[PDB]
Amino acid sequence: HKLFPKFSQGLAQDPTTRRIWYGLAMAHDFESHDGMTEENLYQKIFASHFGQLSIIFLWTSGNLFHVAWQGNFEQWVTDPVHIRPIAHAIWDPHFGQPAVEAFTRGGASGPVNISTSGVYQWWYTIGMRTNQDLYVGSVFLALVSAIFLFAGWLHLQPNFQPSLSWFKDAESRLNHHLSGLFGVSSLAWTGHLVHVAIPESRGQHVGWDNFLSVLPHPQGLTPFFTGNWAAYAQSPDTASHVFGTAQGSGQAILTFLGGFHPQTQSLWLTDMAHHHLAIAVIFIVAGHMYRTNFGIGHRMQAILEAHTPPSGSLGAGHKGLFDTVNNSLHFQLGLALASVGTITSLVAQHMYSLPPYAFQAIDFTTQAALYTHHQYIAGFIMCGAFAHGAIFFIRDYDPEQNKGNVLARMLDHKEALISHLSWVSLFLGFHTLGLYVHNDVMQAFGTPEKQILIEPVFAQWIQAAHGKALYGFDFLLSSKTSAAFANGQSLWLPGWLDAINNNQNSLFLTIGPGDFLVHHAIALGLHTTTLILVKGALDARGSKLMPDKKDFGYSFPCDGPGRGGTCDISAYDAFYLAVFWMLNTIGWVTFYWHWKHLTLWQGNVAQFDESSTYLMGWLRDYLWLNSSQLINGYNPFGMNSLSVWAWTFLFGHLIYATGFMFLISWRGYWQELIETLVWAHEKTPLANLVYWKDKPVALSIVQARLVGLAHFSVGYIFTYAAFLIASTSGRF
Amino acid sequence: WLRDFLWAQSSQVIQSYGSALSAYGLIFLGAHFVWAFSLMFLFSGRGYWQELIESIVWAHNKLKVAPAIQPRALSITQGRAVGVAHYLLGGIATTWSFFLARIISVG
Amino acid sequence: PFVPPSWAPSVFVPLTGLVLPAIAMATLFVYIEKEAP
Amino acid sequence: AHIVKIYDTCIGCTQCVRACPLDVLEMVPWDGCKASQMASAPRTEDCVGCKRCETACPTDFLSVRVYLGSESTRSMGLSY
Amino acid sequence: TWLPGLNPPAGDNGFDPLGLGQDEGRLKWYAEAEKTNGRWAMMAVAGILGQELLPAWWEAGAKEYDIPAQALTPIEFIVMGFLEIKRYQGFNSPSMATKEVKNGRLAMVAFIGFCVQALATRTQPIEGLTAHLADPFGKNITYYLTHLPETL
Amino acid sequence: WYPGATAPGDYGFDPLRLKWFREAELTNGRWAMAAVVGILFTDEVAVFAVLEGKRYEIKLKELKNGRLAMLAFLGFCSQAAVYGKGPIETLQLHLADVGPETAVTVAVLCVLPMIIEAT
Amino acid sequence: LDPQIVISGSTAAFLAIGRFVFLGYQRREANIFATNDPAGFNIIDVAGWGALGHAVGFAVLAINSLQG
Numbered sequence A: 001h002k003l004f005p006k007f008s009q010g011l012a013q014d015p016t017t018r019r020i021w022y023g024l025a026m027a028h029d030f031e032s033h034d035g036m037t038e039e040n041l042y043q044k045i046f047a048s049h050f051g052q053l054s055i056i057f058l059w060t061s062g063n064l065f066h067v068a069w070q071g072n073f074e075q076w077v078t079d080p081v082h083i084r085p086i087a088h089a090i091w092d093p094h095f096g097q098p099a100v101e102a103f104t105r106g107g108a109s110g111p112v113n114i115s116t117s118g119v120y121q122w123w124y125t126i127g128m129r130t131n132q133d134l135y136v137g138s139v140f141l142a143l144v145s146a147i148f149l150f151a152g153w154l155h156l157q158p159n160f161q162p163s164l165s166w167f168k169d170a171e172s173r174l175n176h177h178l179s180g181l182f183g184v185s186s187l188a189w190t191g192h193l194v195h196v197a198i199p200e201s202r203g204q205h206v207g208w209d210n211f212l213s214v215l216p217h218p219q220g221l222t223p224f225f226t227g228n229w230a231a232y233a234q235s236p237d238t239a240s241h242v243f244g245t246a247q248g249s250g251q252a253i254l255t256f257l258g259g260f261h262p263q264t265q266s267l268w269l270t271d272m273a274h275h276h277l278a279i280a281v282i283f284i285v286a287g288h289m290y291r292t293n294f295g296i297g298h299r300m301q302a303i304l305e306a307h308t309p310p311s312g313s314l315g316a317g318h319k320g321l322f323d324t325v326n327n328s329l330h331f332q333l334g335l336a337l338a339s340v341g342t343i344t345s346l347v348a349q350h351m352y353s354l355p356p357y358a359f360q361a362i363d364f365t366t367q368a369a370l371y372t373h374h375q376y377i378a379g380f381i382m383c384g385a386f387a388h389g390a391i392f393f394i395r396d397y398d399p400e401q402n403k404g405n406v407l408a409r410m411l412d413h414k415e416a417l418i419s420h421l422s423w424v425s426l427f428l429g430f431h432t433l434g435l436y437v438h439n440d441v442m443q444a445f446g447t448p449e450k451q452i453l454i455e456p457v458f459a460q461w462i463q464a465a466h467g468k469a470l471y472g473f474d475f476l477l478s479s480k481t482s483a484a485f486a487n488g489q490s491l492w493l494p495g496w497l498d499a500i501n502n503n504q505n506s507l508f509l510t511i512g513p514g515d516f517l518v519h520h521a522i523a524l525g526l527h528t529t530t531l532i533l534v535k536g537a538l539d540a541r542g543s544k545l546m547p548d549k550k551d552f553g554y555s556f557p558c559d560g561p562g563r564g565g566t567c568d569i570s571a572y573d574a575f576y577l578a579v580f581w582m583l584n585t586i587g588w589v590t591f592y593w594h595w596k597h598l599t600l601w602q603g604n605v606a607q608f609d610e611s612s613t614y615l616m617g618w619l620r621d622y623l624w625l626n627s628s629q630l631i632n633g634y635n636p637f638g639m640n641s642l643s644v645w646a647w648t649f650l651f652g653h654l655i656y657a658t659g660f661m662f663l664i665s666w667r668g669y670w671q672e673l674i675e676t677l678v679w680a681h682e683k684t685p686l687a688n689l690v691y692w693k694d695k696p697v698a699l700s701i702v703q704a705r706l707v708g709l710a711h712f713s714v715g716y717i718f719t720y721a722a723f724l725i726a727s728t729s730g731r732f
Numbered sequence B: 001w002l003r004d005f006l007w008a009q010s011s012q013v014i015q016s017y018g019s020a021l022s023a024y025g026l027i028f029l030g031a032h033f034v035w036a037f038s039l040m041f042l043f044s045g046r047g048y049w050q051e052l053i054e055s056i057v058w059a060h061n062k063l064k065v066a067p068a069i070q071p072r073a074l075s076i077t078q079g080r081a082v083g084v085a086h087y088l089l090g091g092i093a094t095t096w097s098f099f100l101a102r103i104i105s106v107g
Numbered sequence C: 001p002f003v004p005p006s007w008a009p010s011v012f013v014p015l016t017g018l019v020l021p022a023i024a025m026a027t028l029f030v031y032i033e034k035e036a037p
Numbered sequence D: 001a002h003i004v005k006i007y008d009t010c011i012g013c014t015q016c017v018r019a020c021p022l023d024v025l026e027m028v029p030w031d032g033c034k035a036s037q038m039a040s041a042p043r044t045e046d047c048v049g050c051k052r053c054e055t056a057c058p059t060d061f062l063s064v065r066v067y068l069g070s071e072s073t074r075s076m077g078l079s080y
Numbered sequence E: 001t002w003l004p005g006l007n008p009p010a011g012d013n014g015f016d017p018l019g020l021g022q023d024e025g026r027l028k029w030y031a032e033a034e035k036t037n038g039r040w041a042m043m044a045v046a047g048i049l050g051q052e053l054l055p056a057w058w059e060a061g062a063k064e065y066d067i068p069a070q071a072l073t074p075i076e077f078i079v080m081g082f083l084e085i086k087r088y089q090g091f092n093s094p095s096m097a098t099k100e101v102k103n104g105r106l107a108m109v110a111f112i113g114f115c116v117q118a119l120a121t122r123t124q125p126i127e128g129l130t131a132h133l134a135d136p137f138g139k140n141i142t143y144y145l146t147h148l149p150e151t152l
Numbered sequence F: 001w002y003p004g005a006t007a008p009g010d011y012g013f014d015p016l017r018l019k020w021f022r023e024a025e026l027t028n029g030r031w032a033m034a035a036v037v038g039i040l041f042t043d044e045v046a047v048f049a050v051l052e053g054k055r056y057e058i059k060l061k062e063l064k065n066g067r068l069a070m071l072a073f074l075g076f077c078s079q080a081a082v083y084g085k086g087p088i089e090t091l092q093l094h095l096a097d098v099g100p101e102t103a104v105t106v107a108v109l110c111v112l113p114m115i116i117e118a119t
Numbered sequence G: 001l002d003p004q005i006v007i008s009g010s011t012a013a014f015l016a017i018g019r020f021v022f023l024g025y026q027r028r029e030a031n032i033f034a035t036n037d038p039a040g041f042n043i044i045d046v047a048g049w050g051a052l053g054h055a056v057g058f059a060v061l062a063i064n065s066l067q068g
């Protein structure tokens, strides 16, 4: 038979074109290759991890190199308010002279792309000032990428392959990753901030030439070893400091001020230094918890066996969970993906509201692009967390090792779980859609004073607790006679109060009944996606329609038309149905984010507060209104710089629509069509001298679902990316 | 077609609120909704829905309200039929509202 | 000593646009269709 | 080849055998049920995996099970 | 026994508090590695003490040179590659062996002393020695870490 | 070809992993020897197709000088495209009194004979 | 302030308290390799309890430097 794929002779003996696709698709599923043991599994995963690291550092070195060669960084740092950040130059021989003139914007020789990734703001805040610095960084990270690719090749070699005991050592890996990978890395970044990034913002160049002969503070290490640590908070940066120069500067390296730098509208470098120093100490201290080869330390299996409550209300508690987290990679992968997805949501929510980098939040397209980019990344990672949890249930879960613990008791009350998730999804859907349709009927019949406008009094109460004097609750940070106010008032509250009472930033935006309705729609999307994903995880072992679902695996097509027909019965198919709800939910949160920020940036937040309460106001004042300059990117009168985003907008609509073909139409139609094509080719003279090596067949059911979801998702992403970038950049 | 036909001529339907043509805006939105609602039936399959109904049936059994006529997910062919019917109704009614609002306001 | 010359996109963009995809697709096609002994 | 298994809950009703469109199953002598018959799958190399047998089986749960496996030219139902 | 009571597990003084030498051939590799790190450290300490007596050792690379230091690295890599390759493809009294091992250990500690000491005091090491001899009580490590601004 | 190297004008150098390749090595070497002689001594369709078809339809020093001339022709193209001068002018600037890549390449190359021994 | 007095007293207090009252509880919960001490209070016990001593001492010095 054939050689490809080498990991599966069952696929290598396939005479069809299914072999190529299934070799492409089952390549990185190492647990199901021929002759795979457990040590070999962990070793190939370790090498693949090194490959991922090398690709990430090559990606970063490429961003640095293309900025350093084809951008305007050294010209951008002189006036970062009026100059657009260039990503990379364009060489497209399919262009015409109007397109070359249109994408030749300025100040550049030829056609360029204008970056919306925030890298100029990030690099300028961390201390880059010249192009050479970016060249040195690019060469350094390319060398680091080569070292990690070499280290993957090296740790594949038989004198360097680690044993199974090295991979299954959890206490040593948590101590080294908490203390070293979190704590020492955060401490070294604090060192970079204090030694380089703060004096570069003071106007003093501290490169590799003079970082040993320039004092970070006029009394170096004498307060640090005397204990007089408040001597590094004395004389901070003045509220009339021009960033990157020496006018209005100070001497402090570690403050705690709160709020924002006044010019850049961004977090203080001294506060970020103090922040990374404090969390560095906390992670280094937390990295001495677990028992390595030194007698002291905690034993995780002992902790888990101890935390079982009395009265049997959790049964056996956490008994036997160490041997099920340790032995399963899908449990660990689902935990890692759940944490990293929630942290990516945290990154987006905290970076729009608390912008860190200098002259971020004045680049509105950068704000919108970074928020939307980490929100969609977070949604995909959360869906993958639940997917690999269902894979954990099918492949790795041993019930006799878990007889009575929390993981078995979840499978015991799975019906109560899915029932109450079904209830909250139905409730939020009926009442959110009913309130929007009610208000639409009121807006249609000319009576806006009848529409149900519930005030978000709970979140307004929370904003008043945070120190916002708009809603008049006046308690705990908004009342001047409070203990929390009076205790934090001397040191960090005077900046936080000014920044939260400024209504010209994203720090705790003013909310109203539209914000109520959209947060309810967000809860609907979250609960519903959680319903499909939890149902797919807990019905993965089997259901009453199919008791032996664990015997077919994770991703099987169906179980046939018997028993009333069983389509999309698998846990993979439940994931597949939940990717749609993920895309819907992130589309809701980013429509909401983008329209509330466009109405903040234009100046009329009254437009959002009036039109946000009804879906015709949505469709008219956001989607119809902000796509006026997008679709005029090219026309029969000419073109301009938005023509690439108009073309990509139509491109995304097309890929979405092409995905609907695989989504709606299914296999046997196409199999009959391909059989008539096979007849036509084998009967056509002077073309039947050419014959296929792989027998052409229609795409399988699971592959069809994957290809349709892939086209659907890529078109969704490209359509909203083109609309968001083009509307924000064309109107600002 | 996207700009000079759909986008340009959709002005009348999207700004029909507060007048006699407001019903065409309501049926524009409603038709968009029904069209989208069809995609759940067209893109999904009855195995998932049968298992979901199993969980819900459990919840009803817990409160002694499970019906004697047993809740079943729609058949494969009925899922397809419901799908295509809501798809057609949605799309056709959308173009209906667009057309009528447009031509009545500019006629 | 870092800046690549002014003619560099005119070679590198059609190289990785046409030549390396042609070589890569031909090589992967011959690797796919290869018989096992 | 697809993995077809017969389980001891079989009551020898022959419904699976007369439902298979490929002559894969057959009835053998047995003593475990009143019919003194059991199904058997001696020719699973020609099985396509249509699951008509599973649709035809009356027992709850199934006494015949089809586990879709590695594809060949016979299991894909190709005439070319 | 580096601190008494602890027997050596399997210049031997029973000093492996991390367990780095629990494998036999691996430990033989670390023995050769200790030998060559100590040899380069002994040559480095003799270099710093010689150059100083008969520009500091940290500012030594940047004065002016014949090529200059742009294209001297590949000559270094070729010559050291031949020497190193010869050493790896190759790879008398035990009193002299233990003196060689302990001398390399003390030279490694002395060289990290040169690096940290010079980086914290900005003095040549014989000036650090004459400073600690002219003032024992005072001009110590406490003085140059609490009075760092004076040295800069 | 190196001290300690093992085998998988041959010298056992095959890091990437035959008779067509040997014939291709010989003809790239012959045309590179003719081209190097032409570049050192510097300072039609159907007949060529017939000669090539007759050549297709059809001892250590030859490929030794061939490998040396292939490296020489790479040298001509490289230090002409980088230096902008001919071979005599680059030799004269070399005598009588891409750098990172050259240095990085040499060190990396040496790291390379070492690595094979390690593995 | 008196940094030597504060750091030395805090380290002495934490080492004495882990040496005398928490040693038996640490030996109960845990259930280099040989010391002269009659309680088995080894180098790693010294490192942990002196680490707590230095940490609490520098925390007290920093709070007193802030004057809070």
Ligand code: CLA
Pocket: A056, A057, A060, A117, A118, A119, A121, A122, A184, A185, A188, A340, A343, A344, A347, A370, A373, A374, A377
């Ligand atoms: C999976 C796809 C994905 C992609 C394409 C991006 C893309 C981006 N991210 Mg996002 N991000 C993601 C997922 C992703 N992210 C996830 C999953 C998280 C949660 C973990 C984040 C959290 C995050 C934050 C907090 C930030 C970004 C930023 C960015 C932007 C800058 C590029 C960059 O990251 O530099 C490449 C980064 C590196 C190569 C590593 C940086 C250095 C690391 C952290 C430490 C190095 C330690 C050092 C080696 C130790 C030396 C020790 C010493 C003793 C020797 C870029 C748009 C930044 C931004 O928005 O700027 C405007 C930004 O601030 N991302």
Ligand code: CLA
Pocket: A024, A025, A026, A027, A028, A029, A030, A333, A337, A380, A381, A383, A384, A385, A387, A388, A391, A554, A555, A572, A575, A706, A710, A714
């Ligand atoms: C920490 C990161 C991580 C790691 C190490 C893994 C590892 C794994 N995953 Mg998991 N997973 C993850 C995150 C991760 N995953 C995320 C973020 C998601 C959500 C998307 C998932 C959802 C998921 C599912 C549903 C499944 C896996 C499976 C697997 C296993 C096999 C992978 C494989 O063979 O597919 C090979 C990969 C492909 C064939 C990729 C195809 C390309 C995709 C469809 C995207 C196409 C878009 C395209 C690139 C855009 C082009 C645009 C154009 C204009 C240029 C492997 C254990 C599988 C498994 O365990 O089977 C039992 C499986 O079914 N993962």
Ligand code: CLA
Pocket: A422, A425, A426, A427, A428, A429, A430, A433, A524, A528, A531, A532, A577, A578, A580, A581, B033, B036, B037, B038, B039, B040, B041, B043, B044, B052
């Ligand atoms: C606009 C399109 C749309 C709408 C409204 C819905 C609505 C719903 N989806 Mg669906 N879904 C969709 C598209 C849509 N989906 C798409 C594109 C996919 C990808 C295949 C899915 C895949 C999917 C999955 C996997 C799941 C859902 C679920 C749900 C329900 C979640 C609970 C809820 O909020 O119900 C609120 C109820 C509604 C929104 C329906 C409105 C009720 C009407 C207005 C009442 C009658 C009005 C009027 C009298 C009608 C008269 C007409 C006459 C001819 C009879 C909800 C009914 C979940 C579910 O079913 O949980 C129980 C679930 O698990 N959906």
Ligand SMILES: CC1=C(/C=C/C(C)=C/C=C/C(C)=C/C=C/C=C(C)/C=C/C=C(C)/C=C/C2=C(C)CCCC2(C)C)C(C)(C)CCC1
Pocket: A330, A331, A332, A333, A334, A335, A338, A342, A385, A386, A388, A389, A390, A392, A393, A537
């Ligand atoms: C299926 C499955 C899985 C998965 C799962 C998942 C995916 C999950 C997720 C999860 C999640 C995702 C969760 C979340 C959570 C969260 C939380 C729990 C939070 C909390 C918070 C808090 C508690 C806070 C508080 C506060 C506030 C609010 C304010 C103030 C400050 C503070 C801090 C106080 C696994 C793998 C296991 C396996 C089995 C199967």
Ligand SMILES: CC1=C(/C=C/C(C)=C/C=C/C(C)=C/C=C/C=C(C)/C=C/C=C(C)/C=C/C2=C(C)CCCC2(C)C)C(C)(C)CCC1
Pocket: A281, G011, G015, G046, G047, G048, G049, G050, G051, G052, G054, G055, G058
């Ligand atoms: C023998 C004996 C004795 C004596 C004893 C002694 C005297 C002891 C001492 C001991 C000691 C004296 C110890 C110490 C220890 C210490 C340590 C171990 C430390 C650590 C530290 C740390 C860990 C730190 C850290 C840090 C840093 C670095 C920075 C900042 C932050 C912090 C603070 C965190 C007596 C007479 C009683 C009795 C008899 C016997």
Ligand SMILES: CC1=C(C/C=C(\C)CCC[C@H](C)CCC[C@H](C)CCCC(C)C)C(=O)c2ccccc2C1=O
Pocket: B040, B041, B042, B044, B045, B046, B049, B050, B072, B073, B074, B075, B076, B078, B079, B080
């Ligand atoms: C939602 C959905 C279901 C679930 C929908 C079902 C089971 C039908 C629900 C219709 C109504 C709501 C149930 C019947 C209502 C009764 C008449 C009860 C009386 C109600 C009073 C108000 C009169 C499927 O069964 C299905 C099958 C195949 C492909 C796609 C899908 C699919 O998308």
